[PDB]
Structure 1
């Protein structure tokens, strides 16, 4: 979603959310990410402003205190940023991709079934549409956020096609953006 994103060109506008909408979004996030519920109050303190940053290609980024927390596209599911996930690694289920596929994950490539069924992978049980943290063997930090396009059962049984769509990866344009800066877009 961010391979060619550049914070200097692709940010359009920003809105600060009202309380009822913030409460609504928190309810959505807890439904998506039951594992976030323990942490939401420190991630999004009730006193601090919550802002949505609009970018190109209908992308929106949810930010608090300049930190990029979640993003979405075309009003679809929220996804956590890698930076957030590194602090709270259990807000998503994990999938471990084989060593042969890692270079390509770091280039925005989707994860094909054979990258999950080979010996160096570990395929965790996960339903279709589940948002997941993509891990390399031996490294504790997620390298990519993806979404299951096939169930883990089907990835194992079928072993063909896109297993996990790659949404956000280490050193992509969102990674490099790091914080929300009000000086990369006009305000009126």
Structure 2
């Protein structure tokens, strides 16, 4: 999703905003991710405002105290950044790819079913279009955030084609936009 970002040249095509409809943007995140309600007190404390950041191809990122929390494209669903998912790794359901798949996910590639049906992989029930955290085999922290393009049962039986779309991965353009000031 971030191809025009990773040309270095940070703080270039990104506008930040002050006064936002703050609570009007929270109540959608609890419905998207239910297991987060007891943690937005720390993630988005009411003592600190939120500041939206909009860079092009029509993406906006929610930030508090500089740190990048969620992002979305146009009016689509919110995705947590990996830096935040790392702090609270239970935000998303997990899908675990095998060790051999890391270097491919790390280069922006979508996840094929061989990546999820391998012995080193671990696939869990997930409906189509659900946001998942891409864990790797011998690794503790999420490698990627994706969205099921096929159901977990389809990935098993069909066992080829695109299983999970690669939306945001370690060392991509959003990853290197550390914080905005």
8 Å Cα contact 1:146/1:168 also seen in 2: yes
Alpha-carbon RMSD across the aligned residues, in angstroms, is 2.1
Deviation at 1:129, TM superposition (A): 0.8
What is the rounded CA distance, in whole Å, between the counterparts of 1:52 and 1:2 in structure 2? 17
Matched positions, count? 181
Deviation at 1:10, TM superposition (A): 7.0
What is the rounded CA distance, in whole Å, between the counterparts of 1:162 and 1:13 in structure 2? 31
TM-score (norm 2): 0.91
Q: Deviations over 1:41-93 (max 9, x none)?
A: 11001121111101011011110000000001111110001000111000000
Secondary structure (helix, strand or coil) at the match of 2:53 reads strand
Aligned to 2:65: 65
Deviation at 1:140, TM superposition (A): 0.9
TM-score (norm 1): 0.88
What is the rounded CA distance, in whole Å, between the counterparts of 2:143 and 2:14 in structure 1? 28
Secondary structure (helix, strand or coil) at the match of 2:20 reads helix
Deviation at 1:21, TM superposition (A): 2.4
Gap change, CA 1:49 and 1:6, over 3 Å in 2: farther
Runs of 4+ in 1 over 4 A off after TM superposition: 6-20
Gaps of 5+ in 2: none
What is the rounded CA distance, in whole Å, between the counterparts of 1:66 and 1:49 in structure 2? 10
Gap change, CA 1:41 and 1:19, over 3 Å in 2: farther
Aligned to 1:185: none
Gaps of 5+ in 1: 182-188
Gap change, CA 1:73 and 1:90, over 3 Å in 2: same
Q: Deviations over 1:80-124 (max 9, x none)?
A: 010001110000000110122111000010001121111111001
Secondary structure (helix, strand or coil) at the match of 2:126 reads coil
8 Å Cα contact 1:11/1:55 also seen in 2: no
8 Å Cα contact 2:17/2:53 also seen in 1: no
Deviation at 1:39, TM superposition (A): 0.6
With a CA cutoff of 8 Å and minimum separation of 6, indicate the structure with the bigger relative contact order. 1
Deviation at 1:6, TM superposition (A): 4.2
